[PDB]
Design a binder for this molecule. Structure first.
Ligand SMILES: CC(C)Oc1ccccc1C(N)=O
Length: 271
């Protein structure tokens, strides 16, 4: 099933859970680098989201989803993603070189295959964002964080969860539908095209999704928003990716395409 690791082996291999530049700062825990094979150890800090992560990972094994190796209770242990998150790579955090348009196209396709796998197997992610799209040694896109995921119809919740800058209008109201995951993917595609984060408190507009309306009101074009840190982008493929993002970002959930359509469209873009 999964490996059951001792707490003290994990404590050891992560230098007694050291937090010096530690890899990531997750929602309900800290991600540490370990050696057992190089691994990622998510030590949870202030319960239900632990069991949900194990349950989802046991059923969901795919090329575009992070692999859970095991757990601990005396901690969640995953395969090491050497190239970190898409967010970090888009911002060139710690001096990493900008991702080329070619790489970005492969990442978008990979992410859409991971989401397709989830929805195929009736799971709603509920927090699709570039920080939750990890990158391996070949820069393969792997969807992460399944602690808030839901085994799916259309339902409502009292505890509204996600990241506001990526959330769909109905998600922000408490609806649980895979249609919300599509909206959030559309925001990620805008981040890939522009190199801009979904929210920037010191930017006009603060929310990236507001650029779709600027483009639509014939004010500006997507060409003016293309990430300048690329030399291999072409109008045809950028416009094609933008067209997919635009469809994903329809305010009315029922007008959005399903993940299968998104997957088809992203493939046609490199055909
Ligand atoms: C799935 C999460 C917990 O894994 C990570 C999170 C953040 C940064 C790297 C990794 C990794 N796997 O290397």
């Amino acid at each position: 099933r999964f490996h059951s690791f001792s707490f003290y082996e994990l404590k050891n291999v992560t230098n007694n859970f050291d937090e010096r530049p530690k890899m990531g700062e997750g929602g309900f825990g800290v991600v540490y680098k370990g050696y057992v094979t190089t691994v990622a150890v998510k030590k949870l800090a202030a319960k239900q989201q632990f069991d949900q992560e194990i349950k989802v990972m046991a059923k969901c094994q795919h090329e575009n989803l992070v692999e859970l190796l095991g757990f601990s209770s005396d901690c969640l242990v995953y395969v090491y993603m050497p190239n970190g998150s898409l967010l970090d790579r888009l911002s060139c955090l710690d001096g990493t070189p900008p991702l080329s348009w070619h790489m970005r196209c492969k990442i978008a396709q990979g992410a859409a295959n991971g989401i397709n796998f989830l929805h195929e197997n009736h799971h709603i992610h509920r927090d699709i964002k570039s920080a939750n799209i990890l990158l391996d040694e070949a820069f393969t896109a792997k969807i992460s964080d399944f602690g808030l995921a839901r085994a799916s119809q259309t339902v409502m919740t009292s505890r509204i969860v996600g990241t506001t800058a990526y959330m769909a209008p109905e998600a922000l109201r408490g609806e649980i539908t895979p249609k919300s995951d599509i909206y959030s993917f559309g925001v990620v595609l805008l981040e890939i095209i522009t190199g801009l984060p979904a929210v920037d408190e010191h930017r006009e507009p603060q929310l990236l999704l507001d650029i779709k309306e600027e483009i639509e009101d014939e004010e500006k074009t997507i060409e003016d928003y293309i990430d300048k840190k690329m030399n291999d982008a072409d109008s045809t493929s950028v416009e094609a990716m933008y067209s997919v993002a635009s469809q994903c970002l329809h305010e009315k959930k029922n007008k959005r395409p399903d993940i299968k359509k998104v997957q088809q469209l992203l493939q046609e873009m490199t055909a």
